[PDB]
Amino acid sequence: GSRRYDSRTTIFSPEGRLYQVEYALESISHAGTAIGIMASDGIVLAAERKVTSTLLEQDTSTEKLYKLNDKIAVAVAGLTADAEILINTARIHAQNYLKTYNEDIPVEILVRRLSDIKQGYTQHGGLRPFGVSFIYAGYDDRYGYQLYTSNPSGNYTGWKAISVGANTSAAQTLLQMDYKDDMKVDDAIELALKTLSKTTDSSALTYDRLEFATIRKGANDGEVYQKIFKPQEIKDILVKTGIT
Amino acid sequence: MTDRYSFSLTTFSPSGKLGQIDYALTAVKQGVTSLGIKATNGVVIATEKKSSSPLAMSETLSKVSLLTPDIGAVYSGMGPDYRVLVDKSRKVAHTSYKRIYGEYPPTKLLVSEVAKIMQEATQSGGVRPFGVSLLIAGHDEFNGFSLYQVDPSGSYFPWKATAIGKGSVAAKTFLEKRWNDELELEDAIHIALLTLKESVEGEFNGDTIELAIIGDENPDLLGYTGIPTDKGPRFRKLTSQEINDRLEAL
Amino acid sequence: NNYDGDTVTFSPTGRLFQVEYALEAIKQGSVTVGLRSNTHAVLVALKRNADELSSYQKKIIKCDEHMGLSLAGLAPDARVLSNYLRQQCNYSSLVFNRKLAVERAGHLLCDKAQKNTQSYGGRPYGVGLLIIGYDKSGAHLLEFQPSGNVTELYGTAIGARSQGAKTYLERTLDTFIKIDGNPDELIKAGVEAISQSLRDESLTVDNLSIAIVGKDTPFTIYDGEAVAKYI
Amino acid sequence: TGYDLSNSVFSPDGRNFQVEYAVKAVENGTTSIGIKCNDGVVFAVEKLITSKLLVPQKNVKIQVVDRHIGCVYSGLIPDGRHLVNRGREEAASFKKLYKTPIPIPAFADRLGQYVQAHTLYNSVRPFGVSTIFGGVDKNGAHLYMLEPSGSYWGYKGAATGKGRQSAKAELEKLVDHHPEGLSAREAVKQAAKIIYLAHEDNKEKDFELEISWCSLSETNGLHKFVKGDLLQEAIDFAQKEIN
Amino acid sequence: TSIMAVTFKDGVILGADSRTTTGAYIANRVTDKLTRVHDKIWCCRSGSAADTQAIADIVQYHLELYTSQYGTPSTETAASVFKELCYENKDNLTAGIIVAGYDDKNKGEVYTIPLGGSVHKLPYAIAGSGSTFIYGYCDKNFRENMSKEETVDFIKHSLSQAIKWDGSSGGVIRMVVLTAAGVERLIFYPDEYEQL
Amino acid sequence: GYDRHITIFSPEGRLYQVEYAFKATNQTNINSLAVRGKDCTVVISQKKVPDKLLDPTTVSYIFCISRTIGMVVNGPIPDARNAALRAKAEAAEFRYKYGYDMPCDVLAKRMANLSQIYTQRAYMRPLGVILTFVSVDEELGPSIYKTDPAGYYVGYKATATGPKQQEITTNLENHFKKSKIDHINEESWEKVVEFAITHMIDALGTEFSKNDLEVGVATKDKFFTLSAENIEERLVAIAEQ
Amino acid sequence: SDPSSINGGIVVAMTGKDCVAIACDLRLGSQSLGVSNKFEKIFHYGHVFLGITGLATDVTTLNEMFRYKTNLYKLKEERAIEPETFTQLVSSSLYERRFGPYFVGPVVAGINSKSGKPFIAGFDLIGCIDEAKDFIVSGTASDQLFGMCESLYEPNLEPEDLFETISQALLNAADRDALSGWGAVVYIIKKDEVVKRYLKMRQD
Amino acid sequence: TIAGLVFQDGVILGADTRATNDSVVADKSCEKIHFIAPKIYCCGAGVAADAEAVTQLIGSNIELHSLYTSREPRVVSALQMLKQHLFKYQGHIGAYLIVAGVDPTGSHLFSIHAHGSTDVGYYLSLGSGSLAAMAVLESHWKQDLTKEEAIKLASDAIQAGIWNDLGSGSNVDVCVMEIGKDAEYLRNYLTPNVREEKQKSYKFPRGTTAVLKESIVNICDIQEE
Numbered sequence A: 001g002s003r004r005y006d007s008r009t010t011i012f013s014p015e016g017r018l019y020q021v022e023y024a025l026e027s028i029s030h031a032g033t034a035i036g037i038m039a040s041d042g043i044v045l046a047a048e049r050k051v052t053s054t055l056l057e058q059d060t061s062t063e064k065l066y067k068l069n070d071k072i073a074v075a076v077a078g079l080t081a082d083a084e085i086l087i088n089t090a091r092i093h094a095q096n097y098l099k100t101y102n103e104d105i106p107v108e109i110l111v112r113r114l115s116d117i118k119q120g121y122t123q124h125g126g127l128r129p130f131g132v133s134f135i136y137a138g139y140d141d142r143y144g145y146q147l148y149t150s151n152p153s154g155n156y157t158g159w160k161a162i163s164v165g166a167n168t169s170a171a172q173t174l175l176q177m178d179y180k181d182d183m184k185v186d187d188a189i190e191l192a193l194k195t196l197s198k199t200t201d202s203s204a205l206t207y208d209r210l211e212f213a214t215i216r217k218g219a220n221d222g223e224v225y226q227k228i229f230k231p232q233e234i235k236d237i238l239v240k241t242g243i244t
Numbered sequence B: 001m002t003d004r005y006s007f008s009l010t011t012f013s014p015s016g017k018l019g020q021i022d023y024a025l026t027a028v029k030q031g032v033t034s035l036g037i038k039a040t041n042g043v044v045i046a047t048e049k050k051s052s053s054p055l056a057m058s059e060t061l062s063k064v065s066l067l068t069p070d071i072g073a074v075y076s077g078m079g080p081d082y083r084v085l086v087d088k089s090r091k092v093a094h095t096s097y098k099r100i101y102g103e104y105p106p107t108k109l110l111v112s113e114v115a116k117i118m119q120e121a122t123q124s125g126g127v128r129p130f131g132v133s134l135l136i137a138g139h140d141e142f143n144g145f146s147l148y149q150v151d152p153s154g155s156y157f158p159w160k161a162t163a164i165g166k167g168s169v170a171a172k173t174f175l176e177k178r179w180n181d182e183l184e185l186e187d188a189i190h191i192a193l194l195t196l197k198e199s200v201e202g203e204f205n206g207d208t209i210e211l212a213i214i215g216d217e218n219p220d221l222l223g224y225t226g227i228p229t230d231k232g233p234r235f236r237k238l239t240s241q242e243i244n245d246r247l248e249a250l
Numbered sequence C: 001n002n003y004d005g006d007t008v009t010f011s012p013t014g015r016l017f018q019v020e021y022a023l024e025a026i027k028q029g030s031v032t033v034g035l036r037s038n039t040h041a042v043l044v045a046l047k048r049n050a051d052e053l054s055s056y057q058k059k060i061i062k063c064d065e066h067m068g069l070s071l072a073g074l075a076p077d078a079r080v081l082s083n084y085l086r087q088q089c090n091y092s093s094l095v096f097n098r099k100l101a102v103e104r105a106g107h108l109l110c111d112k113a114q115k116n117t118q119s120y121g122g123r124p125y126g127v128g129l130l131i132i133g134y135d136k137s138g139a140h141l142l143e144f145q146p147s148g149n150v151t152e153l154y155g156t157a158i159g160a161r162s163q164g165a166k167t168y169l170e171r172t173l174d175t176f177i178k179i180d181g182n183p184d185e186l187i188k189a190g191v192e193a194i195s196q197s198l199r200d201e202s203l204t205v206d207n208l209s210i211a212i213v214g215k216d217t218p219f220t221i222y223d224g225e226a227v228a229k230y231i
Numbered sequence D: 001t002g003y004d005l006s007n008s009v010f011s012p013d014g015r016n017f018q019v020e021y022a023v024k025a026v027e028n029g030t031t032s033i034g035i036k037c038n039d040g041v042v043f044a045v046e047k048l049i050t051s052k053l054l055v056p057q058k059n060v061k062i063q064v065v066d067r068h069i070g071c072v073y074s075g076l077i078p079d080g081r082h083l084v085n086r087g088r089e090e091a092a093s094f095k096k097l098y099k100t101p102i103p104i105p106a107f108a109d110r111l112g113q114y115v116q117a118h119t120l121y122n123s124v125r126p127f128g129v130s131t132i133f134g135g136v137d138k139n140g141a142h143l144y145m146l147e148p149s150g151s152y153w154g155y156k157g158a159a160t161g162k163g164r165q166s167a168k169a170e171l172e173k174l175v176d177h178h179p180e181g182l183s184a185r186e187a188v189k190q191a192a193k194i195i196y197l198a199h200e201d202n203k204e205k206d207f208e209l210e211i212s213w214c215s216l217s218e219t220n221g222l223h224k225f226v227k228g229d230l231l232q233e234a235i236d237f238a239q240k241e242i243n
Numbered sequence E: 001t002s003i004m005a006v007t008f009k010d011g012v013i014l015g016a017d018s019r020t021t022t023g024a025y026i027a028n029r030v031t032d033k034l035t036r037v038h039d040k041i042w043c044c045r046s047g048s049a050a051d052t053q054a055i056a057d058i059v060q061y062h063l064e065l066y067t068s069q070y071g072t073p074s075t076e077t078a079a080s081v082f083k084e085l086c087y088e089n090k091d092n093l094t095a096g097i098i099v100a101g102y103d104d105k106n107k108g109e110v111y112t113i114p115l116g117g118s119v120h121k122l123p124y125a126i127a128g129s130g131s132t133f134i135y136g137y138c139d140k141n142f143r144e145n146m147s148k149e150e151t152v153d154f155i156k157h158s159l160s161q162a163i164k165w166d167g168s169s170g171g172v173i174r175m176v177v178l179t180a181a182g183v184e185r186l187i188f189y190p191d192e193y194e195q196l
Numbered sequence F: 001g002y003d004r005h006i007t008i009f010s011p012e013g014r015l016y017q018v019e020y021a022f023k024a025t026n027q028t029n030i031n032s033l034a035v036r037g038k039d040c041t042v043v044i045s046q047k048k049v050p051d052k053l054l055d056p057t058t059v060s061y062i063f064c065i066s067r068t069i070g071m072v073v074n075g076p077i078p079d080a081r082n083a084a085l086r087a088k089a090e091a092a093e094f095r096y097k098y099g100y101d102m103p104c105d106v107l108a109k110r111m112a113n114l115s116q117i118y119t120q121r122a123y124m125r126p127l128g129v130i131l132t133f134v135s136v137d138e139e140l141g142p143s144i145y146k147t148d149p150a151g152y153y154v155g156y157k158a159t160a161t162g163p164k165q166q167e168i169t170t171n172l173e174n175h176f177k178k179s180k181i182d183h184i185n186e187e188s189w190e191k192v193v194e195f196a197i198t199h200m201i202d203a204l205g206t207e208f209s210k211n212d213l214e215v216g217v218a219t220k221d222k223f224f225t226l227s228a229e230n231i232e233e234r235l236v237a238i239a240e241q
Numbered sequence G: 001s002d003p004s005s006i007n008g009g010i011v012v013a014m015t016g017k018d019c020v021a022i023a024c025d026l027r028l029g030s031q032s033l034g035v036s037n038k039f040e041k042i043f044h045y046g047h048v049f050l051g052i053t054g055l056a057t058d059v060t061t062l063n064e065m066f067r068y069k070t071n072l073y074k075l076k077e078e079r080a081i082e083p084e085t086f087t088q089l090v091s092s093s094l095y096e097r098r099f100g101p102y103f104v105g106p107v108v109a110g111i112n113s114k115s116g117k118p119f120i121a122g123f124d125l126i127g128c129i130d131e132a133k134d135f136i137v138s139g140t141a142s143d144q145l146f147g148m149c150e151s152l153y154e155p156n157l158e159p160e161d162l163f164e165t166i167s168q169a170l171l172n173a174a175d176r177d178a179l180s181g182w183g184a185v186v187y188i189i190k191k192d193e194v195v196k197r198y199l200k201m202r203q204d
Numbered sequence H: 001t002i003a004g005l006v007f008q009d010g011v012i013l014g015a016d017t018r019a020t021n022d023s024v025v026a027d028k029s030c031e032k033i034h035f036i037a038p039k040i041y042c043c044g045a046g047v048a049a050d051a052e053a054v055t056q057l058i059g060s061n062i063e064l065h066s067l068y069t070s071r072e073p074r075v076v077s078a079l080q081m082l083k084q085h086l087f088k089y090q091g092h093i094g095a096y097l098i099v100a101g102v103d104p105t106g107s108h109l110f111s112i113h114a115h116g117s118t119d120v121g122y123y124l125s126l127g128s129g130s131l132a133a134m135a136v137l138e139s140h141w142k143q144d145l146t147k148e149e150a151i152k153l154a155s156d157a158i159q160a161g162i163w164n165d166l167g168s169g170s171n172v173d174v175c176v177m178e179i180g181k182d183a184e185y186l187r188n189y190l191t192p193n194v195r196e197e198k199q200k201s202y203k204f205p206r207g208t209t210a211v212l213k214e215s216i217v218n219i220c221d222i223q224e225e
Ligand SMILES: *C(=O)[C@H]1NC[C@@](C)(O)[C@](O)([C@H](CC2CCCCC2)NC(=O)[C@H](Cc2ccc(OC)cc2)NC(=O)[C@H](CCO)NC(=O)CN2CCOCC2)O[C@@H]1C
Pocket: G123, G124, G125, G126, G128, G130, H001, H002, H016, H018, H019, H020, H021, H022, H026, H027, H030, H031, H032, H044, H045, H046, H047, H048, H049, H051, H052, H094, H126, H127, H128, H129, H130, H161, H167, H168
């Protein structure tokens, strides 16, 4: 019958690894680096675009940084089309929680549900896993500012600072060196850019190569503001920190 | 139907490549050249009508398709795959948008729905990816003019100008020289026609070239008067004659 | 070889190996014999035990008051097909108030086996049956093989060393076909037949199973001391 | 290679090897024939007597569809019973809606399309029979033959199984020597001859002759088996011709 | 409504008034109640207009697919499809259909399918609300193997009495002639038939 | 090489099962030819009856899909008949839903969309056939639209299918280079049939008897096939000039 | 028994010169029994205002339903929905429940943020759009609001005049309805400013 | 009050502009002549949402069909799809429709009832004002009307409705569909019911209304530092 042609995407290796999770993690290793840094007064998301062309329309472009609601954003590393499927699920789940409880979804509950969807594709269905890793940047009134990461396995963990995609090993060492706990958003902005500036496989790091965002409780009257930086603003913060 | 193929036919290989997406992108390359250029006041999409027989009436095969009054598509790769994606793209503009909001979707969102259709053919049971890259040019009130590329993976990207298929590497270099942010639509049709002559071996006239625009509103093309807010389709296929006129001044 | 992975694949010579391997489970199964006259039909079965602590596997199932079979091969498969035949006999009675023709039982079994031999996922039935019955056209004996092939005979035998009994019946055809209105002499002729298929072991009281059906005889099974008479 | 391991796969030639293999199962079968006469059709078939233990005239091979259609087949017998079961459903459903008994062409495509459906998917096996069938409809007599591929044409005469080359050779002579046509009672005798003649290829075991017919004059355009005096007259004719 | 079909020597003729009513209001005064399910198989409709349109449409679809595969279907076969629909949906249909057609073998044939979804093959058939008034007349005046002109007169006279007495009937008398010659539509205005 | 058993991409970007289905097309070793008149569309096809037992009247690769549409197949008959029944069903369903006769070119697109699905769905194998649909369309006039196992279709001024298509193709390409028009300039279909037969005799270099040929004519509001006698009438006329 | 008149309530929307007004009562009851004197029937998604009269469980449900759809809309479109577009969404959403309707009388009010053009609409319970130039009315005192509006209303009223008109429409119509009143709210809406006023009315 | 009639080289549709709820006027300027295709229009009577929804549904599908077949859409197609969909719902979609247009087959006029019955006609009227309209149409319709004649007769049929039927009122909308021309949609073709100037202005002295509390509403997204 059709059995002949089944890859069997949901089995263990004799070492007790899920092949297809591991080969997806391999795929995501070649993706543009995304860095998340959590401070006391906010969270930074920076990410490196993979396709440099002078003719790509940058200001209308989104491959790395998406918004799930008014308090929660993700930075993508992997197949952008796969990430867009999961992003639309996350967007609905936050709005089903809001319709049911009349409260904005706590960050962890959203991340566990995405991570539970990813887990599903590794244990049943015989489909390929989602070739995606997310950094989650979010705020809620229980734990305040939160970073999490998810990966094709459906494992998620929380971080003070984290990277995904290419050169995470190098990226994670550099963060571990310079990151302190009493740190502020302005410093975390400078750390995030400097770390991409060292790990990048490109000759130099320029505004046309980056997506950048912040989540600050530095909105008027103790509210929370998500700022996806426009290309001009990225080029400004690149001069300010002293990288260009 | 005993469709037992409920498992993916696109899987990660040990290097992290998705084989069937890569092979689909190889089918796109072997495909005839198509290109799109975005002007300040419009967008142009252009391709060659590679006729399979001189007994064929190449007018009956359209490579450039209207999706909504304000959105247009062209491709490189397997035509029949493009045809069913056109059928699906037109319908989804209605079912998931027009029947809800009473207007047509903006360019990005219709692109987003096509992307999604193709991402599914990359992960669902018992199907191969689509063997096409689309260029989609449109207008909408709040985003203005836009040009989008959609790849077999589901991935789409906004372009000022680009090319896909056979001589796309050469064509893309040509465009990078000739493009600025002060181009008028007539300047963009001129650069489109120049660029497409480099990748065309044989006859180069209005009968072997298919070129369409997203320009001003054409109230004359509407077919009815007495509704001040419907001002007419922005999508227009240039005629065999209109092309030849521009080739004399080339 | 490369054409034995499932029942949906033909070999280059036009063979269904999965069917042919199912056929093989019958040959490894313990011998059973069927034979008939104009008045009665008889099953004789050599039951097999695991060891000397174990019971002997029952080889004869009752399907209705006028029809039952003997099995050789996978017993659980025999159960499924005997359950199916019970229901078909039962439907005929309840809807048409009519005793199911033995030739029609044959056709129903032949078409149930066949579905498993053409459709992916499923496997052939791993068992052979000898159906006996008395209906509106007298005495009947069928042989069922899980290929789907069903054959009306005067007499036959299936299972290990069945070729012995079958040659005996092939000679005795003119004699036992005339045993009309004498059930004990027809059962003798079958017991004698199944003997030709023995080696080393001989017919004991808890070894031998017999069944009979006929003109004024419901289908009834004799085991244990009820078959001592015939050893 | 590997092209022959899965049904519905095209080889580089443009062939379906599983279907070609099904044909070998058919060629392995006993010989069956059909003969188109003036007003009807005759179906004969070789039945091999494996053992004296086979009850004569009791394992019937030729199957009736509706009241007017006869089907005979060579190869895997249960595959031929599975097809006729489907035939009977098609002719029932057609009669239910359109009232008239299904015409022989309509019926032929109904089988045709079903057999062809069992070459479209790897999840099924092709049919292991060639089926010779026909009857009398409003437009007259009709004889068909249906190969494992779903292929079928009208015939003056048709033949399949092991004795096919012998049968065909003898069928062609009848066509050539009777252009105005063959009567029903003549075709029955000829059918007996051609089965006997084609029994040299299967000569080791002895056999049993089975004939059916539909004839506008001889059966009122209904399918009947040839029994008793008419059967023995055909057997006697055949026995005289081989000697 | 008043509708009939009559077999004669050369074929068959379908007749109908042209009045459609919503209670006492005439919704349409020039209705065509003679509907084509095939080249030479037509039916007369009575009951729910919606129901009989939906039915005739499906039947036309079925006979068109029939023709593609098996060629020209018999009048009987058209009756059988009408019946199948009417009978199996009897709990949701108010349809009373007369089926009439021409073969060269069978010649002219009339079937009536009343509210049962039963089938009846008849030399002639009357149906609709106006038919009650002309049982007497039609039983007395019908003969077999009438000429074309006799059969046009018989229907024109019959439907004329039906229209006079039934408020639900009225308008023009439409007929359709079905012979080897082909398909002739006729119309007769009030100023002809009223004064009969 | 399982990329050669089902309809998934080879590393080259090719669908081998689509390619091998095109090769099944030629298995019948029959050549088909379609040309357009002013008023009509004519399809001729070779008719080979090798077996003397066959009923020649039942040996055809020309199908009456609807009253307007005819369809010649180049391929094995079982796949031909599968496609015929489907086209017939899709044509009658169209007329029921949309209240007009399915146009020739819309049927062709519909059947080519179905073909395309068999090139993307792994469980369905492509049909090994090339469908040539002909009508006199009430909008576009005389029409020829051809479908293949790839899911490709296009309109034709004239076309040819089979082993010796290229010979027939260049013959017709040469004629439409002289006349410089899209169709055979001829009032009567009887003389457009004569044309089609005449150009098939030239291109294939073979003569034809009434039984070696099979013809289909599409006029306004009906498609029909010619009997043996009607063809003979045509053959006589070609010989006498 | 009649779902549209268990809880009571009224909404009225008027256009003015470069402004719209929408106003509601505050009553919620179980027929004769008054329960809440704080039940507001005017909700906003971005700058588009929706008043809803009718069965209070549907008033709450549909608000939660239009917050949900307008949130997603904004996340994809990257812009707030406009009154013209939101009106179609409401109609779509009512008509999708055609044979099991919400028992509500919706009223859309707002200004197109691009064109600057004031816009009001009303709907039957199954989505039929009435796109008035002057005023829309909804609820248990709709007849009373039609009478008050059709007399009191005049086009191109300034923000502080339209406030006086709309307030007097509601207050006098509520006082002739047993199931409306108990307080009221008026929204004065400008392109980049929105005032909200609680009216001192009779508490019977 | 909706009507349509054929003239020399086309078909015309007329409709009033009143929508009712029990005995009150919900709308004085509603458009009952719905767009299906560029040259196919549909007059709507019955349940207002039902007439609006079923014309939009069929109009959406006719657009997808036109795209699919690369042809101008036909009136008989809109007719079949409306009629099959209304029939499926057994009257529960309470829509009464007059369909008219030009296509490559010529000009067409049809009526459709809620249960899925269709009629063919040279003049048709539907809804509470249909008897008033049909009296005018049955008095004045002849063959080969000019366009000037046709528009006069259609608008007279709708006026019969406006004056004599309580269910119908306000203005006359018309739509002209002539062969080989662009369909012209003439909303407020007649305006015979303009409200007379009021006796008084009821504009209040500012401060007339008693206000408990004030507050600014925050309509912007994120008040930001
Ligand atoms: C000429 O003959 C006109 N006569 C006027 C009128 C009103 O009867 C009508 O049919 C008109 C149809 C047009 C109105 C404008 C939009 C396109 C359709 N119909 C209505 O105005 C309709 C009345 C009506 C109510 C109920 C039923 O069946 C029970 C039939 C007709 N009005 C409505 O539907 C209102 C609109 C609210 O603004 N809403 C309701 O009736 C709410 N109920 C509907 C039924 O289900 C319960 C909810 O125009 C013709 C041509």
